Nucleic acid binder design. Structure first.
Lengths: 184, 304, 170, 160, 58
RNA sequence: GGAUGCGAUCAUACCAGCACUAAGGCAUCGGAUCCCGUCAGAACUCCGAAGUUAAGCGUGCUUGGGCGAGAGUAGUACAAGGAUGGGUGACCUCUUGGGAAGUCCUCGUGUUGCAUUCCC
RNA sequence: GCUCAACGAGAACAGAAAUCUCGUGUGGAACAAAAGGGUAAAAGCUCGUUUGAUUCUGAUUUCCAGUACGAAUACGAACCG
RNA sequence: AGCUGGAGCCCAUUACGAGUUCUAUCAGGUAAAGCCAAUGAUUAGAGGCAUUGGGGACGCAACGUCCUCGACCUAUUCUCAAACUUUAAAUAGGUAGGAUGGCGCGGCUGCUUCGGUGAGCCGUGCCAUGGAAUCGGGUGCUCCAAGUGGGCCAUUUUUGGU
RNA sequence: AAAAGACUUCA
RNA sequence: UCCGUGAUAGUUUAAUGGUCAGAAUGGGCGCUUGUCGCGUGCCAGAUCGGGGUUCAAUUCCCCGUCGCGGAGCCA
């Protein structure tokens, strides 16, 4: 698409804008559906979780969120079939991007005299992804774990804030299989 | 199943709830309006609290002259219409004549020359008098303000009848005569201001005599004898009584008033845990049960 | 477990808190307010104006303004009115008219009772009769000063209200 | 830019009461009375809207300058500038609470007076200062029944 | 060209040199601008007080 | 302990559902001549004879909820000062300090001043 | 004096909104306006009575030179409600 | 106006003062935390529940039944907030730690008290190193005048802007 | 008196 | 692009002061008419989308989309 480098909003530098009522004119959020795959089970049929956990606190765009998500899902259908595992996107894009828009072409751009100043027209939105956040949570079953790991790997090149694949465990997968069946 | 109110509170819990600590305990009981109370308390003038509807009524009325302090109030005198038959009275204890005599009694009691603080010149202990306009102790009515409480200011009330007895007792309430239960409400004379009908001690006298059932103890005239009686100067009674018995009250109270839990709580829990494993139905309140595993905790593990 | 187990009613028996007879059409759609006259004769006592609030469908664009009128009656007078309406309605029928509060209402023409069409300025085809019913122990919540919420015991139910009424004049 | 200065600004919580303390103030505050030169805190009731001081003056403890009808005059000192002077503010008795900043200290002055009277009886030698923190004395235990175990720091896990 | 509009910098440094002082403690501090009653009774009482003070020192 | 009037501290005092209350008191409750009041004596105001503990009121209970309190809650997060410390920077270590909150788990569930009265 | 936003269940006509009723209801409303606080036997909403939205001349708080001016605060001295 | 100097003015380790700490006690809504706490955003299911949101099937009908899709509701779940916050730091910030004080004695008032009751202010008497720590190659105070009135930079914090 | 215009092919 | 300015029936454009919207023409329907037309009687709105204020908004604000004009140096 049309150029914007991700560096512009990469720094967590500005005040956080998620107040819709003051921040008028915010355009379309970009992920169609956050949960792709199953959504009739959680951990019951998926006694393995893999996470992609943030190494660097930086604001990842909605555009980059889509890119990572779609690549991961496409691997799922191409290597494990349509109704394989379950991908969840787990962070949502609160932070409205203003940013400088609408340049001119005299021998100045930046209309007033060279400000420019606030009152920036909205360009899009980002999710603020801080360190240790789970951007993508893909639940899996342990035998087929390597497929999910591979899917996350293709995804990870497609956001500005570096993340590290990790085998995630909640109540273990060995504390669940105790606590459940003592109160059941 | 549905349900609202209960459901709408428990979901949003804390948000209501704390609603009872918006206002406090006195209001919760229905005792003290803080919008009324605040006005009185700045200059610390005594509350001449005289209830007569939805407090104590239809058996007795009472007039207490009450001073405030910061650790809580402290009555400087009290008197009950229930203590009025000690001085003789057997006509209704809910009437104006009873209220008037309670006011006379209270005014005599509040000093009784006690302690340092007096004023018995002027004339505190105001004579047996046929009224017209507020008799005080010169120029200055002080230290008693008619506290109706939460009850309405309505002309022809027992509260204003008590106020008349305060004035003719030597207590000096601030006043205006445009809502007062006038002169002849004691039974006396009237015929003035906005107020109408002269009689209210002698209300009853017409009422009963047009036949119908009402109080025993005779007849129309009988008010006047005990109207006179509370004016007299033999103050300083209210009964010697037999005191307590042992450990607070009674076996009925011993069964009624205190606790159980600590030890008892563990037994009910033990019974409940046994019941859960013996049947499996509901762990109590609104769901669960499929062996269980003790307490509220179970639900979180019984998810996956 | 309703504290029914006692010996029942001295306290428990139903009464009329009020009977509210109200006209509903709305001004300009029926009249100015000349139908105050028919209400005045029927009850025997004064009606007072009822104002409107919120969205309305019909003229009444100011909202707050006379639009209807009503009479709160009670005692023996209310019971007498009840008998005429009960005499109409089929009896041992419908749970629907009874509320969970234990109150019920019925519709029927104004004209029932001995009276002329001619003498009141309007005849009027009918109008909601509502009967407000509750137990003796209701008075705690009703009075202002010592207001307290209604207990389970203190509530009449739809079944209970119908049952009490079943005995008397239906 | 010449001065303006929006009269309030950042008074959101300063004029608010927290959720639990909403509703009408107990009349105890009103009934509470002070004498001149007593030290008292300033801290508004949010349910009285006239007689209110400017919010910066909260958390100051002042000496009662005089007492008048309804409101009480309390002298407190402003901060920031040059030669910062004491200022007298008309502030409600609803907006004045007792400071315990002087109360406890006054009790300890009375305690010193006890010690002074006692000291003379012995044959003077007063010394009625409070004493700074001393050195630690020795301490014991017994090595019997307390032979060493070994304890270690524990290994890093990422848990995420 | 823009210029500075306001800064609170450097104000503090000056203030701690010769500034702030304290109230200036005295017995009998200013009751100037105090409510008329109290002051009225002080005037009246003092006239009598001087006469009596001589008696109570003999 | 209870009750009543006046409260103080101000959720251990509150919410939900149950259960119990001797004594005496409150309440509910019967009446509408009178002051007073409404669309309606339901409210309010007055009379207080005849009732009823059903509710109010109080207290107790229920793995309850909330509130309070504690924790290896967590020494975590964050943060002043120091570095010619590591790191491209983003930041991150350490030294000298200070140190939460929730999740979550555990324990608690009104106290008490004045006056008068009541247990038996 | 009264209690609201809202919702549920009822009630000729009347539907999603008419008007009427009860329960629940911390304020989720309303208090002219911008926005934000605050507020519940009120400051809201309704009724009743009203005219202090008054007379004098200071002090005090803000802006601050610790100035004027405006506006605010709480008193006094008057007279009223 | 402040900073700066001069001319001094008053005392001098008496005295009080302090870009300070402690102690003890206030105030604060930032960092952060929180969201199954209120408000606002926001993801996902799951399980309920209709005298009236829409479909179909079973029915002559029903105050009928079953699937279905919506609303809502409940317990969950996920992730955020400068103009959200119950909650909530640190570093900062205010006040107090006494002879400019306390106590006893007894005087006056038009105030205040229905009451010498109280309040304030006067005369007179009693109590020292003694009111945490530390320092004051001294401090306190007044008059008057110059210059300045364009600032610039670094570490740290931070707003706009790639 | 002024309101009066159009109107297919073989024909 | 910056500062302005509109939008209303099929089409073209009036109007309000807050409770309320029109006309003309086209079209659809009879009648005129040998037959159409002129003429003659009949008829018909998302007041741009969008929230807000407000009892009540087509009307009074704010934003945005579209369609326009008019400015934008030493060039």
């Amino acid at each position: 698409m049309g150029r914007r480098p991700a560096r512009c909003y990469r720094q967590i530098k500005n005040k956080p804008y998620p107040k819709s009522r003051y921040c008028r004119g915010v355009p379309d959020p970009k992920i169609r559906i956050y949960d792709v795959g199953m959504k009739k089970k959680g951990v019951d049929e998926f006694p393995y979780c893999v996470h992609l956990v943030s190494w660097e606190k930086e604001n990842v765009s909605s555009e980059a969120l889509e890119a990572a998500r779609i690549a991961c899902n496409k691997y799922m259908t191409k290597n494990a079939g349509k109704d394989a595992f379950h991908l969840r996107v787990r962070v949502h894009p609160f932070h409205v991007l203003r940013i400088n828009k609408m340049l001119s072409c005299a021998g100045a751009d930046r209309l007033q005299t060279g400000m420019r100043g606030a009152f920036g027209k909205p360009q899009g939105t980002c999710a603020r992804v801080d360190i240790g956040q789970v951007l993508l949570s893909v639940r899996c079953k342990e035998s087929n774990a390597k497929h999910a790991e591979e899917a996350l790997r293709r995804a990870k090149f497609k956001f500005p804030g570096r993340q590290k694949i990790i085998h995630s465990r909640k109540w273990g997968f060995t504390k669940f299989t105790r606590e459940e069946y003592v109160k059941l | 199943m549905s349900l609202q109110g209960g459901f709408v509170k428990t979901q949003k819990t804390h948000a209501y709830f704390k609603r009872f600590q918006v206002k406090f305990k006195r209001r919760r009981q229905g005792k003290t309006d803080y919008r009324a109370r605040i006005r009185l308390t700045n200059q610390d003038k005594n509350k001449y609290n005289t209830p007569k509807y939805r407090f104590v009524t239809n058996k007795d009325i009472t007039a207490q002259i009450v001073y405030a302090t910061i650790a809580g109030d402290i009555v400087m005198a009290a008197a009950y219409s229930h203590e009025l038959p000690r001085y003789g009275l057997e006509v209704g204890l809910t009437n104006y004549a009873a209220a008037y005599c309670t006011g006379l009694l209270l005014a005599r009691r509040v000093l009784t020359l006690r302690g340092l603080d007096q004023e018995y010149e002027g004339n505190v202990e105001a004579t047996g008098e046929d009224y017209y306009v507020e008799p005080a102790d010169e120029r200055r009515p002080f230290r008693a303000l008619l506290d109706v409480g939460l009850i309405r200011t309505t002309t022809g009330n027992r509260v204003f009848g008590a106020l008349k007895g305060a004035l003719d007792g030597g207590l000096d309430i601030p006043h205006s005569d445009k809502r007062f239960a006038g002169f002849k409400k004691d039974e006396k004379q009237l015929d003035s201001d906005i107020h109408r009908k002269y009689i209210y001690g002698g209300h009853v006298a017409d009422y009963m005599r047009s036949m119908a059932e009402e109080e025993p103890e005779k007849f129309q005239a009988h008010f006047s004898e005990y109207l006179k009686k509370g004016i007299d100067a033999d103050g300083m009674e209210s009964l010697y009584k037999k005191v307590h018995a042992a450990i607070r009250a009674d076996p009925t109270m011993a069964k009624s008033t205190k606790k159980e839990p600590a030890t008892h709580k563990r037994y009910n829990l033990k019974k409940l845990t046994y019941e859960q494993r013996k049947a499996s139905l509901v762990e109590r309140l609104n769901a669960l049960n499929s062996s269980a595993g003790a307490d509220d905790d179970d639900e979180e593990e019984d998810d996956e | 477990m309703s504290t029914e187990k006692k010996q029942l009613n001295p306290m428990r028996d139903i009464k009329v808190q009020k009977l509210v007879l109200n006209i509903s059409v709305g001004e300009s759609g029926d009249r100015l307010t000349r139908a105050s006259k028919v209400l005045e004769q029927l009850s025997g006592q004064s009606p007072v104006f009822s104002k409107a609030r919120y969205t309305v469908r019909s003229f009444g664009i100011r909202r707050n303004e006379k639009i209807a009128c009503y009479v709160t009656i009670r005692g023996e007078k209310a019971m007498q009115l009840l008998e005429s309406g009960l005499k109409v309605k089929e009896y041992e029928l419908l749970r629907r008219n009874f509320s969970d509060t234990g109150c019920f209402g019925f519709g029927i023409q104004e004209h029932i009772d001995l009276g002329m069409k001619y003498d009141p300025s309007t005849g009027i085809y009918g109008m909601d009769f509502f009967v407000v019913l509750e137990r003796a122990g209701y008075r705690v919540s009703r009075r202002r000063r010592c207001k307290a919420r209604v207990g389970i015991h203190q509530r009449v139910t739809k079944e209970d209200a119908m049952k009490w009424f079943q005995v008397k004049y239906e | 830019m010449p001065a303006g200065h929006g009269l309030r600004s950042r008074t959101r919580d300063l004029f608010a009461r927290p959720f639990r303390k909403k509703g009408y103030i107990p009349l105890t505050t009103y009934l509470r009375t002070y004498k001149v030169g007593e030290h008292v805190d300033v801290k508004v009731n949010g349910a009285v809207h006239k007689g209110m001081p400017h919010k910066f003056y909260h958390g100051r403890t002042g000496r009662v300058w005089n007492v008048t009808k309804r409101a009480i005059g309390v002298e407190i000192n402003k901060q920031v500038g040059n030669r910062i002077i004491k200022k007298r503010i008309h502030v409600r008795v609803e907006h004045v609470q007792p400071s315990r900043c002087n109360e406890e200290f006054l009790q300890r002055k009375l305690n010193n007076d006890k010690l002074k009277a006692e000291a003379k009886v012995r044959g003077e030698v007063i010394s009625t200062k409070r004493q700074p923190a001393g050195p630690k004395p020795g301490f014991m235990v017994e090595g019997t029944t307390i032979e060493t175990v070994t304890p270690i720091p524990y290994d890093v896990v990422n848990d995420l | 060209a823009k210029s500075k509009n306001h800064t609170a910098h450097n104000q503090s440094y000056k203030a701690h040199k010769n500034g702030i002082k304290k109230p200036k403690r005295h017995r009998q501090t200013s009751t100037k601008g105090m409510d008329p009653k109290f002051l009225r009774n002080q005037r009246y009482s003092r006239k009598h007080n001087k006469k009596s003070g001589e008696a109570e020192s003999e």
